[PDB]
Amino acid sequence: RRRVIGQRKILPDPKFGSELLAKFVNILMVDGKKSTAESIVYSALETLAQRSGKSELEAFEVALENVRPTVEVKSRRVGGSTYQVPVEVRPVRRNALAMRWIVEAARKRGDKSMALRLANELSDAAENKGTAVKKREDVHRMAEANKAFA
Amino acid sequence: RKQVSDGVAHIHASFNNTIVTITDRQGNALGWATAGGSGFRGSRKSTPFAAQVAAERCADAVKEYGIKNLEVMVKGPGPGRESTIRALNAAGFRITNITDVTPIPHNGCRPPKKRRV
Amino acid sequence: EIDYKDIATLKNYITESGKIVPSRITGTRAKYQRQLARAIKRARYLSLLPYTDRH
Amino acid sequence: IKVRENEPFDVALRRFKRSCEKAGVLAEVRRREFYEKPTTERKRAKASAVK
RNA sequence: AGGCGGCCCCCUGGACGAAGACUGACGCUCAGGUGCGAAAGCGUGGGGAGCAAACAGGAUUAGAUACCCUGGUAGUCCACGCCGUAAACGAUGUCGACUUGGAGGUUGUGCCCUUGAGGCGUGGCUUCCGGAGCUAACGCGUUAAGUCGACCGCCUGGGGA
Numbered sequence A: 001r002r003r004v005i006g007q008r009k010i011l012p013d014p015k016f017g018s019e020l021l022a023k024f025v026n027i028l029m030v031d032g033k034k035s036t037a038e039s040i041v042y043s044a045l046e047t048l049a050q051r052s053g054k055s056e057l058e059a060f061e062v063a064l065e066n067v068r069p070t071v072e073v074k075s076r077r078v079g080g081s082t083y084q085v086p087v088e089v090r091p092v093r094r095n096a097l098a099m100r101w102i103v104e105a106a107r108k109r110g111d112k113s114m115a116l117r118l119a120n121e122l123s124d125a126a127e128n129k130g131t132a133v134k135k136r137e138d139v140h141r142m143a144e145a146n147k148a149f150a
Numbered sequence B: 001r002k003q004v005s006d007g008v009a010h011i012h013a014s015f016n017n018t019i020v021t022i023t024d025r026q027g028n029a030l031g032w033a034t035a036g037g038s039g040f041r042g043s044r045k046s047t048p049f050a051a052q053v054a055a056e057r058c059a060d061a062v063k064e065y066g067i068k069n070l071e072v073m074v075k076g077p078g079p080g081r082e083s084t085i086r087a088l089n090a091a092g093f094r095i096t097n098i099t100d101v102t103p104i105p106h107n108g109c110r111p112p113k114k115r116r117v
Numbered sequence C: 001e002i003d004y005k006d007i008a009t010l011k012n013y014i015t016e017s018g019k020i021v022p023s024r025i026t027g028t029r030a031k032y033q034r035q036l037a038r039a040i041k042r043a044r045y046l047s048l049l050p051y052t053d054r055h
Numbered sequence D: 001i002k003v004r005e006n007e008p009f010d011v012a013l014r015r016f017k018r019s020c021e022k023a024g025v026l027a028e029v030r031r032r033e034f035y036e037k038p039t040t041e042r043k044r045a046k047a048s049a050v051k
Numbered sequence E: 001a002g003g004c005g006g007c008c009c010c011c012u013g014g015a016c017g018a019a020g021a022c023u024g025a026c027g028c029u030c031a032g033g034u035g036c037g038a039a040a041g042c043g044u045g046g047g048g049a050g051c052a053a054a055c056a057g058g059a060u061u062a063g064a065u066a067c068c069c070u071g072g073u074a075g076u077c078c079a080c081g082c083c084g085u086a087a088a089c090g091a092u093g094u095c096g097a098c099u100u101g102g103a104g105g106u107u108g109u110g111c112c113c114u115u116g117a118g119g120c121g122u123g124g125c126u127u128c129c130g131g132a133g134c135u136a137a138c139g140c141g142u143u144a145a146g147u148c149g150a151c152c153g154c155c156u157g158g159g160g161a
Helices: A020-028 A061-065 A097-107 A114-124 A134-141 B042-046 B048-060 B081-089 C030-044 D029-035
Strands: A071-077 A082-088 B006-014 B017-023 B029-034 B069-075 B094-100
Touching (some): A071 A134, A097 A114, B006 B081
Parallel strands (some): B006 B069
16 A cells, blocks of 8 residues: 555664664564674674774675665566566665675574674675675666666 | 778568668668567567667678668668667767658558458 | 649648648548549659659 | 658657547547537638638 | 449440420339349359468467468459359338428539628438437437328248248
8 A cells, every 4th residue: 555654763773873783683683582683793793893994883884885786676467477677776775685685694504603604694795706696686687687678 | 891881771660570681772781680689589579679789780790881871761660760770870870861661551462351459 | 723733732732751631631621632632643643743652 | 740851860759749530530430420510619610711 | 232442545324403395194013024242152264473261280278170370272363154142231112292490511403782711592412419209119200110192022939940
C-alpha cells in the first residue's frame, strides 16, 4: 500500500555520534542481543586502526565508500513475460548497501570469534583483491548497462 | 582504397528487425550490419540500442572511406529511425536528405486477406 | 473545370507525401471528392504526378 | 500540414493532433449519425470560408 | 440475385422526369416453359510468379495430427464447358393504394421581388431517428411487420430425414 514509510528514525551511537554506527549494530545483532554487538563494533576495528589512511574515525566508512551505486537490476513481470529492469538506489540506501553485504559475509564465516569473522571481510572490503568477490557487484554493473526496450 | 566523403545509406527499421547498409551514389554497398549480428533477437531487434550497435558497426565498416556527407533511404514503420540517424551522425556524417521508401503495400503479388495487430 | 489536368490545382489537394487529403480538411462534398480523386488518379496516367512519392 | 518538411529531418514528429483518427475523419464510427445530426455543435461549416 | 472497381477507345443493356403527342384497357400475375454463380469441384486444353490444402523437415508439447517456420502438389489465372451451390442472410415473392414528423445526401423537373458566400416547390433513388397501428418480443414505421384488393408457391414438433 501507499500511506507507509519511508524510513523510521534511529538514534546515533552515543560514543561516536554516528547514525551509520547505529544502523550497523541493529543489523549486526542477533536475537535482539545488542549488548553483545556493542562489544563487537570497534573490537573488530583493532587491526584497522593504523591501516586506515583516513584515520581510525573513517576506518569503517571507507568500506562503505567503496560501493555507492545509483541503480540495481530487478526481474519484473509485465504479463506472460518477465524481464530485467533497472531500479533506482536512493540516497537513503546508497550509504547502507555495502554495510548489509559485510554482515552477511561475517555471519556466513566459521573461524575465530565474531569480532574476527567481521574483521576478515573488513580487511578486504575496500581492496576487493579476493577471487570471485566482485560478483557481489554484478547486480549494479548489469544496471548501469541495462538496455531493455527504450 | 580511395576516400569519397559522399554516400547513401539504406536503413530498414521494423517492430521486429533493424538493418543498416551504406552504399555509394551508384548503389554499391561499402558496409553492412544487422542487429542480429550485433547480438539482438526477436522483438528486441527493433530497439534504439540494438540499432545503435549495428549503425556504429556499419559506420566502422565504412571507416576506410572517410565519409562526411550522406543521404538516407528509410524503410519500415519502426520508431528507431531518429535514434539510428543520430547514432550514425555520431560518426561525423551530415545527413542532407532523408526519404522514406517503405513497401507499405502498393504492392504486386497476391493481396493478403488476414487481419492486423 | 476548364481542363482538369492543372497540376498546380491538383498539388493543392495532396499532402507533402502526395496523399489525397480527406474531404473534411477541404470542406469538400463527396460528389466532388470522388471526381477530384478520379482527377488525381488520372493525373498519374498523364505522368503529371507519381503513383507514390516513394518512386 | 503535420509532417511538411522535406530533405533534412531530426527526432520523431509522428504524434500529432487533428485529421486521421478523430477531429474529424476515422475512428468513433460506432457513433454513426453523430457525424451529421448534431450540426452546429460538431460541424462549423457552413460556407463563406474553406467550404 | 450472385455481384461488378483498376488507365483509354469502340460498341452496348437497364433506370428517371415535365408539358404535350399516339393507340384506346393494348394491362397485372403466372403451373409448366426460356434464361443468370460469390466460391469450391469436375471436363477438354493451357499455365505456375504469388499463396497453398495434402505430404515432408524442425520446433513448441503429455502428444501437437494446430499456431510458429523452411519447402510444396491440386486449385486460384485463361479459351472455355458442366452444375445450378451458400449465412444466394440487408431473412422483406410480384402488382395496386391510403397515411405523420425530422435530420441528411443525390438525380430529374419547374420556379424564385434569388442583395444567399444561394433559396424553394415537385417526381425517382435513399441513410438514420421518430408518431399511429400490428406482433409474445425485437421492432416495422409512408422505400411498413399499419391498411387492403389481384396472382403463384410454402407451413402444421423434434430424434430418425
